[PDB]
Design an enzyme around this catalytic site. Structure first.
Site, PDB file in Angstrom:
ATOM      1  N   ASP A  17      -0.479  -9.917 -58.356  1.00 21.47           N
ATOM      2  CA  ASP A  17       0.931 -10.145 -58.634  1.00 21.47           C
ATOM      3  C   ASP A  17       1.110 -10.907 -59.952  1.00 21.47           C
ATOM      4  OD1 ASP A  17       3.820 -11.061 -58.050  1.00 21.47           O
ATOM      5  OD2 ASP A  17       3.318  -9.898 -56.256  1.00 21.47           O
ATOM      6  N   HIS A  57       7.400 -14.892 -58.335  1.00 23.54           N
ATOM      7  CA  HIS A  57       7.229 -13.816 -57.363  1.00 23.54           C
ATOM      8  C   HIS A  57       5.865 -13.885 -56.650  1.00 23.54           C
ATOM      9  CE1 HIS A  57       7.913  -9.593 -55.926  1.00 23.54           C
ATOM     10  NE2 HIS A  57       6.613  -9.495 -56.133  1.00 23.54           N
ATOM     11  N   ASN A  60      11.589  -0.551 -53.099  1.00 28.20           N
ATOM     12  CA  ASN A  60      12.955  -0.997 -52.832  1.00 28.20           C
ATOM     13  C   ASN A  60      14.027  -0.033 -53.334  1.00 28.20           C
ATOM     14  OD1 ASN A  60      11.696  -3.391 -51.901  1.00 28.20           O
ATOM     15  ND2 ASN A  60      11.801  -4.291 -53.955  1.00 28.20           N
ATOM     16  N   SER A  74       8.424  -6.450 -51.174  1.00 27.42           N
ATOM     17  CA  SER A  74       7.494  -7.450 -51.704  1.00 27.42           C
ATOM     18  C   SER A  74       7.271  -8.624 -50.751  1.00 27.42           C
ATOM     19  CB  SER A  74       8.023  -8.018 -53.024  1.00 27.42           C
ATOM     20  OG  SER A  74       7.808  -7.122 -54.095  1.00 27.42           O
TER      21      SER A  74
END
Ligand SMILES: [Ca+2]
Length: 279
Positions: free
Chosen positions: A39, A69, A161, A224
């Site tokens: 990530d 994130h 998403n 996520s």
């Protein structure tokens, strides 16, 4: 063990129904397992990680998470308050820049890195990788995820998403990894969650409280956020024995809460990650 006033997603993962707020889990808590968070990085100094997190690789000028994130995802895997597997070891691989972007070539390099790097780590109970990222279909990205899985790592990836069929996204569309959709606290498919035959499981993804950079916390939403619930669950189940990297996705699906989610399109699994812990 019981954690009162837990984030709703943690409570959901240890419950046969929606609307409770205590997380129940075996005290082993993923001890002896490892989870790679691939990530934007992980703020390892965050008190919530208790020294159990560390950066092991970056492809950029720093290994610092300048976004948040990756830190949030890592928190859902294994932070003391916000995590599923509260005693796992967390390894950060920074394939995304501080804007949350990354070239597929860098992402692929990161996956192959983890497949090798696990041989440099102590993970007697097993190894998991959490990939809260994705883009358009790429056979090369899918193949990298497949290699990582084949190497003996439980790979969990976000479905995406787009409120669309995940067949058109990578690594979501790779059959051999565990593709994770998102749900909300009322057991609805999250409105943004991808779906389709390639999905293996759903996890909590709407309004998820976890760690953030600068030693803070925040609530955000996405597949996520669902992905690290499943990654943490796998690590937890692996230290209990229960399953292995090659079998964990199947095991999680076998033991999931079934048929409890709403607005699951015809042809998509109706399965919600569940630890089956009996206190
Ligand atoms: Ca899959």
């Amino acid at each position: 063990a019981a954690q009162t006033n837990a984030p709703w997603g943690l409570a959901r993962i240890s419950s046969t129904s929606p609307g409770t707020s205590t997380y129940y889990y075996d005290e082993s808590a993923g001890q002896g397992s490892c989870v790679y968070v691939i990530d934007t990085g992980i703020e390892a100094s965050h008190p919530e990680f208790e020294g159990r997190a560390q950066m092991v690789k970056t492809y950029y000028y720093s290994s610092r998470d300048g976004n948040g994130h990756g830190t949030h995802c890592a928190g859902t895997v294994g932070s003391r308050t916000y995590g599923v597997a509260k005693k796992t070891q967390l390894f950060g691989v920074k394939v995304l820049d501080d804007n949350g972007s990354g070239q597929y070539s860098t992402i692929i390099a990161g996956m192959d890195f983890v497949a090798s790097d696990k041989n440099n780590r102590n993970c007697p109970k097993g190894v998991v990788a959490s990939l809260s990222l994705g883009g358009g279909y790429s056979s090369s990205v899918n193949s990298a995820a497949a290699r990582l899985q084949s190497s003996g790592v439980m790979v969990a990836v976000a479905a995406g998403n787009n409120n669309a069929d995940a067949r058109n996204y990578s690594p979501a569309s790779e059959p051999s990894v565990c593709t994770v959709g998102a749900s909300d606290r009322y057991d609805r498919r999250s409105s943004f969650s991808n779906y389709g035959s390639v999905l293996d499981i759903f996890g909590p993804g709407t309004s998820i409280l976890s760690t953030w950079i600068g030693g803070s916390t925040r609530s955000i939403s996405g597949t996520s956020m669902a992905t690290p619930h499943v990654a943490g669950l796998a690590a937890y189940l692996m230290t209990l024995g229960k399953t292995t990297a090659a079998s964990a996705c199947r095991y999680i699906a076998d033991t999931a809460n079934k048929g409890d989610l709403s607005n699951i399109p015809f042809g998509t699994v109706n399965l919600l990650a569940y630890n089956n812990y009996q206190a």
